[PDB]
Design a protein around this ligand. Structure first.
Ligand SMILES: CC(=O)N1C[C@H]2CC[C@@H]1c1ccccc12
Length: 185
């Protein structure tokens, strides 16, 4: 890929975060806490899962950012509609307004319905996410493997503004406490 030059400065939106998440002062890192984080509930917060949105909203153009996933056992990354459901149980699918990939139990999968197996030779420590609003494209790149393509969603029906989407995953095992981190330009 040569997509680096549509780089956008993403920050996390505290108000959308699950109440157990801890967002750094610079709003560039998020991790699971060991308890509820002493914040009020609001209609924006994801209730059931350790999810948060980016502050940025996109309705046009080309956007690129990178996320560090070092030493995590489980995570979800991509983009979603601003209008996605926040409360209760739901699946990550384009029909529900999500364009995502994940790591779960040593397998990488794209969030189609049903989910699609990914073929990654070099487990990634850093993921690049590229959105072309007009083209209807969301692509994922393996930064650890010289930017090799992971997966492309095409003919996407965004149907409104998009937000960067993050899930740090649960930490039942004790091996998934590490943060997601937005990487510098
Ligand atoms: C009581 C309850 O249902 N939970 C507590 C904890 C672990 C599972 C679930 C949950 C969802 C989101 C964030 C934190 C949690």
């Amino acid at each position: 890929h040569h997509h680096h030059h549509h780089m956008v400065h993403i920050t996390l939106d505290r108000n959308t975060a699950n109440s157990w998440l801890i967002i750094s002062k610079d709003r560039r890192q998020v991790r699971m806490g060991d308890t509820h984080q002493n914040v009020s509930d609001n209609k924006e917060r994801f209730s059931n899962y350790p999810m948060v949105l980016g502050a940025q909203r996109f309705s046009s153009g080309k956007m690129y950012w990178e996320v560090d996933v070092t030493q995590k056992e489980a995570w979800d990354l991509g983009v979603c509609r601003d209008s996605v459901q926040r409360k209760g149980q739901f699946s990550l699918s384009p029909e529900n307004g999500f364009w995502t990939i994940w790591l779960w139990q040593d397998s990488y999968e794209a969030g189609t319905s049903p989910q699609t197996t990914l073929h990654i030779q070099v487990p990634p420590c850093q993921i690049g996410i590229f959105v072309d609003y007009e083209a209807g494209v969301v692509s994922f790149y393996n930064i650890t493997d010289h930017g090799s393509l992971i997966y492309t969603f095409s003919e996407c029906v965004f149907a409104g503004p998009l937000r960067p989407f993050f899930n740090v995953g649960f930490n039942y095992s004790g091996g998934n406490a590490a943060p997601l981190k937005l990487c510098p330009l």
